[PDB]
Amino acid sequence: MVEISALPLRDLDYIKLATDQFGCRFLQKKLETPSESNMVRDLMYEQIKPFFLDLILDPFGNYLVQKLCDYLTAEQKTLLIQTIYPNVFQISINQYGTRSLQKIIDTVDNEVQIDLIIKGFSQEFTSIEQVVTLINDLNGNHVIQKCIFKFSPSKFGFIIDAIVEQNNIITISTHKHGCCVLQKLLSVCTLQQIFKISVKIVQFLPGLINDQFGNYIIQFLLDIKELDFYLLAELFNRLSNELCQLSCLKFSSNVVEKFIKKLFRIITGFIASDDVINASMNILLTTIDIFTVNLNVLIRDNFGNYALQTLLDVKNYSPLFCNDFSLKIGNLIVLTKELLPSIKTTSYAKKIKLKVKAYAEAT
RNA sequence: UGUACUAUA
C-alpha cells in the first residue's frame, strides 16, 4: 500500500482496492482531502462504472460508495443510479447493500434520481410481495424508512399499494419492524393516504386490536384528529359488544384506555365538530354502562382494572348530556368503593380508594 | 399490578 502511494493516480486498481478492507479505508481517507479529491474520484468513477452493483453489495466496497456519495457530481451520481435502480430489492435486502442505498437516498440531488429509485421500486422491477418483504426485513425496513423521510409523499405509491393489497396489513402491522415502518409512513402521509390505509386497518381491526404490535397502530390512529368523524364510529360499531373482553387482554387494554381518554379530551375540550362531540358523548355513556355492568370482573381483572381506573379518573373529566353523566358515573363509583375490601390484598386496592375519594371532593 | 424501537469494516 505504501508503494501504491508512490504510484501516480492514473495507474491504480480501484476495484481491487475497494474490495479490500485496508485498500478501501485507504481510498476513503483520500476523498477526505481537498488536495487529491477531484482527481481521485474522476479516475475512481471511470474505473467503476460497470461495477456499481458489485461495489454496493461488496462487504468492503459499500463503504466506498457511501463515502463517494458525499463527493459525487449530480451528473455522476445520476449515472450510478441509472445503473442500479432495477436492483433496489436485492440491494436493500442485502447485509452490505442496504447501507449503500440509504446513503444514496439521503444524498439525492434532484427529482430524476428520486424518480429512478422510485421507478426501481415499482412493479415494473419490484413486486408487491417483495415490497412487503422489504418492509419487514432487518435490512430492508431501514431503506423504506429513508424513502419515507427523504421523499415527498407523492412518491409513496409503491409502499401504499403493498399495504392496502389484500391482508398484508396483518403481515406488516403484526411484525416487529413493519409496525415501526407503518407509523413512520403515517407520520408524514397526506390526509388521503392516511384515510386509504385507515380503511384497511378498520377492515382487519379484530386482528390488529390485540396484537403485541398491531395495538400500537390503532392507538396511533386515535391521535390523528382528522379521523374523528370516521374512526370513532367504526371502532365502537365493531368492538362495543366485547369491550369487557377487550379491556382484560394485555394489549387491547391499552387501546381501550387510549380510547376512553380520547372521548374525555374531546368532550372536555368543547367546554371539534358538534356531531363528533355529540357522538363521543353517546359512546362514552355507552362505555360507562358496560363497565358498570362488568364491575365485579374488571376491578378483579389483572388488566381490566387499569381500564377501569382510567374511566374513573376525575383528573380526566374534572370540567364535568352532562346530567346523565353524573348518574352513570355516580352509580359506577358509588358501588365501586363498595368493593374495595373485596380486593384488600391487591396492589391497586388503595389506588382506587384515592380515586373515589377524589370524586367525592370534586362533587 | 400491564406491551414493541432494529442492521455491514
The domain that holds A131 is classified in CATH as: 1.25.10.10
What is the resolution of the experimental data for this entry, in Å? 2.7
How many structural domains compose chain A?
1
**Contact between residue A126 and residue A158 where contact means Cβ atoms under 8 Å apart:** yes
End-to-end CA separation in angstroms for chain A: 83
Residue of A132, A158, A133 lying closest to A147 (CA atoms) = A158
CA of A88 to C1' of B8 (A): 17
Q: What technique was this entry resolved by?
A: X-ray
- Nucleotides of strand B lying closer than 7 angstroms to a protein CB: 1-9
CA of A342 to C1' of B3 (A): 28
Domain residue limits at A63: 1-363
CA of A25 to C1' of B9 (A): 8
Return the half-sphere exposure (C-beta side, CA atoms, 13 A cut-off) of residue A166.
Answer: 6
- Written as nine digits, the cell of A270 is 368543547
CA of A247 to C1' of B2 (A): 11
CA of A89 to C1' of B3 (A): 32
Rounded distance, CA A285 to CA A282, Å?
5
Nucleotide with the nearest C1' to A22 CA: B9
Residues whose CB is less than 8 angstroms from the CB of residue A171 and which lie 6 or more positions away in sequence, other chains included: A132, A136, A178
For chain A, the three-class secondary structure string (H helix, E strand, C coil) is: CHHHHHCCHHHCCHHHHHCCHHHHHHHHHHHCCCCCCHHHHHHHHHHHHHHHHHHHHCCCCHHHHHHHHCCCCHHHHHHHHHHHHHHHHHHHCCCCHHHHHHHHHCCCCCHHHHHHHHHHHCCCCCCHHHHHHHHHCCCCHHHHHHHHHHCCHHHCHHHHHHHHCCCHHHHHHCCHHHHHHHHHHHHHCCHHHHHHHHHHHHHCHHHHCCCCCHHHHHHHHCCCHHHHHHHHHHHHHHHHHHHHHHCCCCCHHHHHHHHHHHHHHHHHHHCCCHHHHHHHHHHHHHHHHHHHHCHHHHCCCCCHHHHHHHHHCHHHHCCCCHHHHHHHHHHHHHCCCCCHHHHCCCCCHHHHHHHHHHHHCCC
Radius of gyration, alpha carbons of chain A: 28
Nucleotide with the nearest C1' to A66 CA: B8
**Contact between residue A156 and residue A119 where contact means Cβ atoms under 8 Å apart:** no
What's the gap between Cα A209 and its chain centre? 16
CA of A177 to C1' of B1 (A): 29
What residue is closest to B4 (Cα–C1')?
Answer: A213
What residue is closest to B8 (Cα–C1')?
Answer: A96
Residue entry with cell 391521535 = A223
CA of A106 to C1' of B2 (A): 39
Nucleotide with the nearest C1' to A303 CA: B2
Protein residues closer than 7 Å by CB to strand B: A 21, 24-25, 28, 59-60, 62-63, 66-67, 95-96, 98-99, 102, 138-139, 141-142, 145, 176-177, 179-181, 183, 212-213, 215-216, 219, 250-251, 253-254, 257, 302-303, 305-307, 309, 347-348, 351
Nucleotide with the nearest C1' to A211 CA: B3
